[PDB]
Amino acid sequence: METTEEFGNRFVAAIDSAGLAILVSVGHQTGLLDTMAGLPPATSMEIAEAAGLEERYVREWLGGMTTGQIVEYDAGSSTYSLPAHRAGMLTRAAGPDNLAVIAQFVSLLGEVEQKVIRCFREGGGVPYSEYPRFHKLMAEMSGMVFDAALIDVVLPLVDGLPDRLRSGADVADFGCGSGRAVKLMAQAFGASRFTGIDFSDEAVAAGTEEAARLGLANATFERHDLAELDKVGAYDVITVFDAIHDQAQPARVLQNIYRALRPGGVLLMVDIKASSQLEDNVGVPLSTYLYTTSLMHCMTVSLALDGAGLGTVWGRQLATSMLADAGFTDVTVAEIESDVLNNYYIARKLEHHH
Amino acid sequence: METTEEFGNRFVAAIDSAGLAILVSVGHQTGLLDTMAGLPPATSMEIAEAAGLEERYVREWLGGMTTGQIVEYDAGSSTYSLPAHRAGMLTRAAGPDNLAVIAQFVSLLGEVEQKVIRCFREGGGVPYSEYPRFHKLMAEMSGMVFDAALIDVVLPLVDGLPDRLRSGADVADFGCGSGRAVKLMAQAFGASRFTGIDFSDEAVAAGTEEAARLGLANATFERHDLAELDKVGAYDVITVFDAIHDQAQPARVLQNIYRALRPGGVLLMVDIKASSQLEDNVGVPLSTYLYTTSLMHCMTVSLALDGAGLGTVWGRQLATSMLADAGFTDVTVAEIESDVLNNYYIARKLEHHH
Numbered sequence: 001m002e003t004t005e006e007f008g009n010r011f012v013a014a015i016d017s018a019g020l021a022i023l024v025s026v027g028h029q030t031g032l033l034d035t036m037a038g039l040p041p042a043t044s045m046e047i048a049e050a051a052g053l054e055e056r057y058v059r060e061w062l063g064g065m066t067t068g069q070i071v072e073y074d075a076g077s078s079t080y081s082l083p084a085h086r087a088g089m090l091t092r093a094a095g096p097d098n099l100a101v102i103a104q105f106v107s108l109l110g111e112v113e114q115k116v117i118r119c120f121r122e123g124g125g126v127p128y129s130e131y132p133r134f135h136k137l138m139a140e141m142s143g144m145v146f147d148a149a150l151i152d153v154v155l156p157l158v159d160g161l162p163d164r165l166r167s168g169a170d171v172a173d174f175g176c177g178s179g180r181a182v183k184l185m186a187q188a189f190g191a192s193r194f195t196g197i198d199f200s201d202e203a204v205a206a207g208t209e210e211a212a213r214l215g216l217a218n219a220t221f222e223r224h225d226l227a228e229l230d231k232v233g234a235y236d237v238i239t240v241f242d243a244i245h246d247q248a249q250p251a252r253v254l255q256n257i258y259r260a261l262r263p264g265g266v267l268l269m270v271d272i273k274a275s276s277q278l279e280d281n282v283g284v285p286l287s288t289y290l291y292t293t294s295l296m297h298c299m300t301v302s303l304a305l306d307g308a309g310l311g312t313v314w315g316r317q318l319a320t321s322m323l324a325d326a327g328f329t330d331v332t333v334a335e336i337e338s339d340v341l342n343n344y345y346i347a348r349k350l351e352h353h354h
Numbered sequence: 355m356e357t358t359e360e361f362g363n364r365f366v367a368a369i370d371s372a373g374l375a376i377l378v379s380v381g382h383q384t385g386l387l388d389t390m391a392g393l394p395p396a397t398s399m400e401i402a403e404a405a406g407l408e409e410r411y412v413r414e415w416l417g418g419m420t421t422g423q424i425v426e427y428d429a430g431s432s433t434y435s436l437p438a439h440r441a442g443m444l445t446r447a448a449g450p451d452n453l454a455v456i457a458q459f460v461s462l463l464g465e466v467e468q469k470v471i472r473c474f475r476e477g478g479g480v481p482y483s484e485y486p487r488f489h490k491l492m493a494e495m496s497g498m499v500f501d502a503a504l505i506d507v508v509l510p511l512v513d514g515l516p517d518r519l520r521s522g523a524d525v526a527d528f529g530c531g532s533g534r535a536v537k538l539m540a541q542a543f544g545a546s547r548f549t550g551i552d553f554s555d556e557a558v559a560a561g562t563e564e565a566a567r568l569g570l571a572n573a574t575f576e577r578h579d580l581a582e583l584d585k586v587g588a589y590d591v592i593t594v595f596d597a598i599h600d601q602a603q604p605a606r607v608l609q610n611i612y613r614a615l616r617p618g619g620v621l622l623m624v625d626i627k628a629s630s631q632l633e634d635n636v637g638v639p640l641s642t643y644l645y646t647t648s649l650m651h652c653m654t655v656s657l658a659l660d661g662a663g664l665g666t667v668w669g670r671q672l673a674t675s676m677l678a679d680a681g682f683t684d685v686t687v688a689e690i691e692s693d694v695l696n697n698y699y700i701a702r703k704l705e706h707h708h
Contacts, residue, residue, distance in 0.1 A: 004439045007443065008443055008453070011443070012453070014372075014422075015640070015643050016639065016642040016643050017371035017372060017642075018375040018457075018643075019645070019646030019647070020642050021369060021372040023642070026649075030474045052475075054477050056653070056657065057474045060645060063632050063648075063667060064642045064645030064646050064648075066636060067637075067641035068368075085357065086361050089361065099362070099369075106460065107463075107464035107468075109373075109461075110460060110467075111465050111467075114487075116411075117380060119408065119411060120380075120384045133468075278416075278417050278427055279429040281417070282421050282423075283421075286366060286369070286370065288370040288377070289372075289373045291415075291417040292374075292376055294417075295411065296376070299414050303410065309410055311414055
């Protein structure tokens with residue numbers, strides 16, 4: 001049984017961990033972590049010089065990184081070092097496995113804390129437009145994951161999908177952002193036609209420009225809100241990467257996906273790995289982070305639009321039953337051993353004609 | 355030796371702890387924690403009703419508080435409860451020992467993260483005026499500590515001080531804010547004359563109004579910047595609660611304090627308990643929090659004024675030597691067993707006439 005003293009100590013340690021997360025975020029954005037990964041043991045002044053930064057700031061940062069047991073300090077020589085085993089997951093050299101990137105979300109949620117608190121009292125939500133930095137970061141992170149794994153790891157989860165794409169299919173990516181996924185797929189699969197759909201006029205224009213740059217005649221982009229579409233029996237394959245649980249009208253989006261698929265078609269929906277039952281998420285790493293991210297961003301943005309507010313932790317069971325509600329009678333859930341955060345939902349449409 | 359895997363797990367746990375700190379902050383500001391401390395096990399809807407808050411927000415908050423192992427959830431009945439041993443240090447009923455208050459500093463530092471990051475590149479600092487919420491909270495927290503401990507615990511650390519005040523002394527409080535400390539002392543010690551000095555015209559006016567309210571003829575307030583004072587042999591006793599390490603010109607402030615004291619006088623300076631040597635702070639609870647608070651507030655506000663930027667962790671050794679530089683040849687450091695964050699520096703002035 002946990003005592004008052006033990007709880008006090010655990011919570012003070014959480015406070016220290018929170019400070020440390022912010023320091024790591026600062027370390028990422030300033031290039032300090034990258035800089036120390038390329039240095040031998042060095043003074044505060046040496047580190048600041050190598051980083052091109054103000055030493056007084058670097059010095060205070062170093063102090064907290066040291067008390068947080070990430071940076072190691074040698075008092076005899078007044079030198080600091082970032083152990084290689086830690087550097088390996090806190091630097092840009094790790095790309096999508098750089099955990100310092102996730103640390104940035106602590107400041108990002110903090111920036112909206114007062115706005116979210118108001119919603120506890122007054123209802124509604126904080127609009128999508130309040131989170132430009134948050135969204136920019138998610139887009140960068142997803143770009144790296146698509147580059148690393150989309151073609152060779154993710155698409156092969158769907159039995160027969162790489163051959164179908166090679167042979168030739170009509171494909172859409174719903175919620176395509178700048179069109180990274182469409183770009184990669186259109187390159188890998190010249191026989192297939194790809195349409196990226198996104199709500200942002202800017203993102204769509206950027207997709208179109210980039211497809212023109214690279215001579216990708218088989219990639220087009222279109223601005224639409226995913227809840228209001230006129231696509232009917234248009235696509236053999238539809239991808240949806242992380243977009244559904246944020247929607248104002250997720251059920252209508254899923255219904256639109258089903259309508260847009262041709263008979264024999266397949267939806268690949270990638271969304272957050274968690275249970276729809278709270279008790280199952282207790283003890284699983286990142287569960288608190290996921291509830292917090294939901295409360296302070298993914299849930300509230302949907303509620304701003306008087307939406308469903310399913311949140312980040314909507315969960316496998318609810319996702320599976322909503323796919324059934326949308327008309328899919330054939331749903332499987334795939335996992336990648338090297339991916340703790342995502343489920344890969346594979347939903348196939350009956351071959352039967354209307 | 356810590357492995358890559360072990361570091362990965364520890365840092366993911368820090369991320370979860372950071373989320374949990376933000377949730378606790380939200381719990382404090384919304385009254386949710388207070389509400390649950392007065393309830394039996396209850397549903398999300400019951401809790402939201404009791405709190406007067408939007409259930410959908412309460413529900414998501416509950417999820418993260420549960421995965422963070424603060425709130426307990428019973429899946430059989432869908433009820434939540436806040437154990438008494440945890441409630442005891444997360445609710446307003448604990449006053450200055452409410453740890454939920456310290457959790458608010460995570461959002462507060464997050465709100466300034468981008469501004470601080472700019473200073474790593476461009477120098478200078480983030481001005482004091484950027485932190486009104488932060489300062490309001492510190493003032494509330496200090497108010498409660500003064501109410502609880504100033505008269506009966508803190509002032510008795512100085513041998514002979516309560517009797518000297520009872521008998522009659524000229525006293526000043528440097529950095530008095532709204533004048534809480536002066537108010538309490540002026541009430542306890544009718545024979546003594548108290549002057550609160552603060553940089554804020556508003557704080558000073560509020561002090562004066564309140565002294566008029568309560569018929570405290572022996573309490574006055576004056577607006578001055580602590581670095582530029584004309585007080586010479588004016589006071590037998592000077593108090594400085596938490597104000598020195600934030601100053602642009604701390605050495606000049608301490609010199610002004612020494613000049614302002616009469617021969618035989620005493621300074622009571624209360625400031626942060628930590629070492630001036632980084633290696634000593636490693637492993638001490640709250641050290642990371644203190645470096646982070648320094649980097650993102652106390653140090654940077656001083657640097658904004660092209661100041662000393664000593665920071666929150668300036669430390670005992672440096673504080674002691676700066677008191678010597680200011681002219682004090684007689685300095686002791688007192689601790690209160692029930693106070694991990696503050697040192698009590700007692701600096702006495704020679705009895706010898708100019």
